[PDB]
């Protein structure tokens, strides 16, 4: 099966009587889901993946742009991306796969899992958890220009409220637990140097903050207290929200080979958000 770029189709369980943007978009763009599809596990097969060169990501990005540029209530719904006639999607089943190189347990499917297309910076919300241990993924770890996508194995709840001023609460215990596991994984990759975190250092104003959309309202939260009982982040709005933090986008500082490496929250290339969900998939021509 050659790898092939083709135009995917989408499937969802949107409702046609519902006014919210994602349902309206999916009702015209997508077909109904197969509620119970079969998955063929491929015995003895190995295939090479490259999550950083995956035309599925480009396609999802265009679709999500279309959704936002189409449009009330705004709650992301699951969208499946699906291989058209003559094609299939290969799914990597290796539970600690770095997204590049060989994968052993592979299965073929017509569609991805249902992905919520959540638009956010710094923290990945409401996504897929790693099945086993925390996983970190980068295109090249020794290039500090390449962002690191972290996938957590346990969700961290983030609850946000408004009183223009607003805040988000995170459990301090759970967050310190999450940072410890991330540190262990970063050391494996950086010659067991000491790991430091620091707040975002620049870029567009919405990437220096944790920014996200909470049913209609755009929230911009200061994450210094996360990267430096509950942790309360101050936010500006430009209504309650509870989400699961399921991942992080990090960037490593450049410089001299000190005894330490420092990492900062980043993001802004929404294509990394889509990679964090699509890393295990690849389109092939079956014919």
């Amino acid at each position: 099966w050659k790898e092939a770029n083709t135009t995917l189709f989408c499937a969802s369980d949107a409702k046609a009587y519902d006014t919210e943007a994602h349902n309206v978009w999916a009702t015209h763009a997508c077909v109904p889901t197969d509620p119970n599809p079969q998955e063929v596990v491929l015995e003895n097969v190995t295939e090479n993946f490259n999550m950083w060169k995956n035309h599925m990501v480009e396609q999802m990005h265009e679709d999500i742009i279309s959704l936002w540029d189409q449009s009330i209530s705004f709650e992301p719904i699951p969208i499946h991306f699906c291989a058209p006639a003559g094609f299939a999607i290969l799914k990597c089943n290796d539970k600690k796969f770095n997204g590049t190189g060989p994968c052993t347990n592979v299965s073929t499917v017509q569609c991805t899992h249902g992905i919520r297309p959540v638009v956010s910076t710094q923290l990945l919300l409401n996504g897929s958890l790693a099945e086993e241990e925390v996983v970190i993924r980068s295109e090249n770890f020794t290039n500090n220009v390449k962002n690191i996508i972290v996938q957590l194995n346990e969700s961290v709840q983030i609850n946000c409220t408004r009183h223009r001023q607003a805040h988000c609460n995170i459990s301090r215990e759970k967050w310190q637990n999450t940072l410890k596991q991330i540190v262990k994984k970063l050391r494996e990759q950086f010659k067991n140097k000491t790991i430091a975190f620091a707040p975002s250092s620049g870029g567009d104003p919405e990437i220096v903050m944790h920014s996200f959309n909470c049913n209609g309202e755009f929230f911009y939260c200061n994450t210094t207290k996360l990267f430096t009982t509950v942790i309360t982040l101050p936010c500006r709005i430009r209504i309650k929200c509870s989400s699961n933090i399921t991942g992080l986008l990090l960037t490593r500082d450049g410089g001299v080979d000190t005894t330490k490496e420092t990492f900062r929250p980043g993001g802004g290339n929404m294509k990394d958000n889509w990679r964090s969900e699509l890393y295990k998939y690849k389109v092939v021509r079956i014919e």
Partner: nanobody, 126 residues
Framework: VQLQESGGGLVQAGGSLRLSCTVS????????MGWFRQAPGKEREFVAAISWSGGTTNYVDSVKGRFDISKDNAKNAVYLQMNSLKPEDTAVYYCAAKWRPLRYSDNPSNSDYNYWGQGTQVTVSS
């Protein structure tokens, strides 16, 4: 290709070129479009950007007063007028797009753009 640049050429210092980029990919009111360039041997650097909806612009200091970035939304087009060209302007010029759905300002980004063209080659002699 999503983005395709044209207008590159060989020019004499003090001359002018006009670069064009047609954006075949999906655009939106929260996009920025820009131009970046890479001179032989050196790293890629920002040149100019424009907000797709608002038209706010930004330039690298070494082109101010000489380069102008403009757009035509109905043609999905962005343009870089380059006047008073200097040998230091010699480079591959890339058009780029960035979707910024969460932006709260019209000022365009100068880094980390979603996708890039193949580039158009510019040589400025003398």
């Amino acid at each position: 290709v999503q983005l395709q640049e044209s207008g590159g050429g060989l020019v004499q210092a003090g001359g002018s070129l006009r670069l064009s980029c047609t954006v075949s990919a999906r655009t939106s009111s929260s996009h920025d479009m820009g131009w970046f360039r890479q001179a032989p041997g050196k790293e890629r650097e920002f040149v100019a950007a424009i907000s797709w909806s608002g038209g706010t612009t930004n330039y690298v200091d070494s082109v101010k007063g000489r380069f102008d970035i403009s757009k035509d939304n109905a043609k999905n087009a962005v343009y870089l007028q380059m006047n008073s060209l200097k040998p230091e302007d010699t480079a591959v010029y890339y058009c780029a797009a960035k979707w910024r759905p969460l932006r709260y300002s019209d000022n365009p980004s100068n880094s980390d753009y979603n996708y890039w063209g193949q580039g158009t080659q510019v040589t400025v002699s003398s």
